[PDB]
């Protein structure tokens, strides 16, 4: 279930990255021209910077998750082979 979970996380992170990127570009448009995606502004330009940061973080997260997923993929192949060959060796 580790690989299934990692794939689900990768899908979620991809959707988030797409949304944040669209928000960043729309905030760029609205700069030339309530909500909480403005970063530390409460604590358009600020939303643009916050969405840039968020989409970059989503990209970093996708890369890390993909690395972990590929490690799990390789480990699963190796383990499955180990079980198959262990059984075959037992019978041989």
């Amino acid at each position: 279930a580790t690989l299934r979970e990692l794939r689900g996380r990768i899908r979620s992170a991809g959707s988030i990255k797409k949304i944040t990127k669209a928000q960043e570009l729309i905030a760029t448009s609205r700069i030339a021209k309530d909500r909480g995606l403005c970063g530390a502004y409460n604590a358009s330009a600020s939303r643009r910077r916050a969405m840039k940061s968020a989409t970059d973080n989503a990209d970093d997260l996708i890369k890390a998750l993909t690395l972990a997923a590929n490690r799990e993929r390789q480990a699963q192949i190796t383990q499955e082979i180990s079980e198959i060959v262990g059984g075959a060796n037992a019978l041989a």
Partner: protein
């Protein structure tokens, strides 16, 4: 001419016979365990010819107490079970012994449990809808009369409750014969079902065959065949419509895998026997309607660890006409029956069979739920207010739709205190047509949870303040 036990390792026994007396494959042999506490007669099924007059057999009973060198007798035929109308109303084990009345059926005609499937020229595709009164099944996963229905799902998602619900909904008024195969499941459940059928007066029309999970692997491999032999007799000889319920057909494959390495077979992927698909195919191709002779079969299929890519359920999928897939994720939300509407399927969910209205409403429901699943991650991280207004409308509709696919089922009263309900197909189609159009968006989503039709919806909404 009798054989002698040579090797014993768990449920696998090697038997040596005199030259020229080696039993045929699948023949039943008899050996005696004379130890007092466990004294019994073992039935061994010949699995392989090892050469040099040795045969490898699978025991149907526990081999504790069995001794090397004991005599082994070849019955000359395979395992055979009583057939005929007499079996209706009684409980049997994999070998054909009556449990509720020992000795009953010993004089019936006996059929070998090993049989070839019907000839291909006798097969006719079945496309008649079998209405159940369950909203989700009728709308999205319509069952087929004389077709092959399965309920897939991980451990404890509601396969058995759904099987009992379909026994209540289909078998109660069925004009034909019912066969139930308990395959490697809980003995408590078997007793519960026996008592429930007696209570509903459905037992007199039902033959029950049980090989439960405490039985050795041989019994779990052959009990499905025994029940199927009874059903095949009813289909082929008596010429009546048959209802076949199997719970759980995965246990047949699992029992095969438990002994595969002891039979000397190199393991396949994921630890399964190399002959997974072939043995499954023999068994499943026997489970079928033929031209003019109907078997409506419903099988519960366990999905190990909720992994629908596991080889056992993946191989099973190709054998069904309709598949209700139960999801742990849906279960954990409290949605019952925990059907995954996006993953379930039916070969008759097509405009030609169900009609344009049914098909269009079903496709719209599926589209909305798919879009909602696409949006869930965004809603979780960024919140719902960041969605478009149209997507917010879709999310509200989807939450109401997914709740309205849940239903209070009769067989679930014991788990909720609430009596079940039945929704006619026409009401289901009209209600979900209205839901997809947004006609109930003014009601709280909680009004749609565990109810029947639109009258129940109006009542529940009133009880929560709103009005339909």
């Amino acid at each position: 001419t009798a054989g002698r036990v040579v090797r014993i390792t768990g449920p696998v026994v090697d038997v040596e016979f005199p030259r020229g007396s080696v039993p045929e494959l699948f023949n039943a042999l008899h050996a005696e365990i004379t130890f007092g506490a466990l004294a019994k007669t073992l039935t061994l099924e010949v699995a392989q010819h090892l050469g040099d007059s040795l045969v490898r057999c699978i025991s149907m009973q526990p081999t504790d107490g069995l001794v090397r060198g004991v005599e082994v007798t070849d019955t000359g035929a395979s395992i055979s079970v009583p057939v005929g109308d007499g079996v209706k109303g009684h409980v049997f084990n994999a070998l054909g012994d009556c449990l509720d009345d020992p000795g009953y059926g010993k004089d019936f005609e006996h059929w070998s449990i090993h049989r070839k499937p019907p000839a291909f020229s006798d097969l006719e595709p079945r496309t008649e809808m079998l209405e159940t009164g369950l909203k989700v099944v009728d709308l999205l996963t319509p069952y087929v009369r004389g077709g092959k229905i399965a309920l897939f799902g991980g451990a404890g998602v509601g396969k058995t409750v759904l099987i009992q619900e379909m026994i209540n909904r289909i078998a109660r008024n069925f004009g034909g014969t019912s066969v139930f195969a308990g395959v490697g499941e809980r003995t408590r459940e078997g007793n519960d079902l026996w008592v429930e059928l007696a209570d509903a007066n459905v037992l007199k029309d039902t033959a029950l065959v049980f090989g439960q999970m405490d039985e050795p692997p041989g019994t779990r491999m052959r009990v499905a065949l025994s029940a199927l032999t009874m059903a095949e007799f009813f289909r082929d000889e008596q010429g009546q419509d048959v209802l076949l319920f199997i719970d759980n057909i995965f246990r047949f494959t699992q029992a095969g895998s438990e002994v595969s390495t002891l039979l000397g077979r190199m393991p396949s992927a994921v630890g399964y026997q190399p002959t997974l698909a072939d043995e499954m195919g023999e068994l499943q191709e026997r489970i079928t309607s033929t031209r003019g002779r109907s078997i409506t079969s419903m099988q519960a299929v366990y999905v190990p660890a909720d992994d629908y890519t596991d080889p056992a359920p993946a191989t099973t999928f190709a054998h069904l006409d309709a598949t209700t897939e139960l999801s742990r994720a849906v279960f954990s939300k409290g949605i019952f029956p925990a059907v995954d509407p996006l993953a379930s399927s039916s070969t008759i969910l097509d405009p030609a069979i169900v009609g344009d209205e049914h098909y269009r409403v079903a496709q719209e429901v599926i589209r909305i739920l798919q879009r909602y699943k696409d949006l869930q991650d965004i809603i979780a991280i960024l919140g719902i207010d960041e969605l478009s207004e149209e997507d917010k409308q879709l999310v509200n509709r989807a939450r109401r739709i997914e709740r309205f696919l849940s239903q209070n089922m009769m067989a679930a009263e014991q788990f909720t205190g609430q009596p079940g309900s039945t929704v006619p197909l026409k009401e289901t189609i009209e209600a979900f047509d209205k839901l997809t159009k947004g006609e109930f968006d003014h009601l709280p989503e909680q009004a749609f949870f565990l109810i029947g039709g639109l009258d129940d919806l109006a009542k529940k909404a009133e009880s929560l303040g709103a009005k339909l």
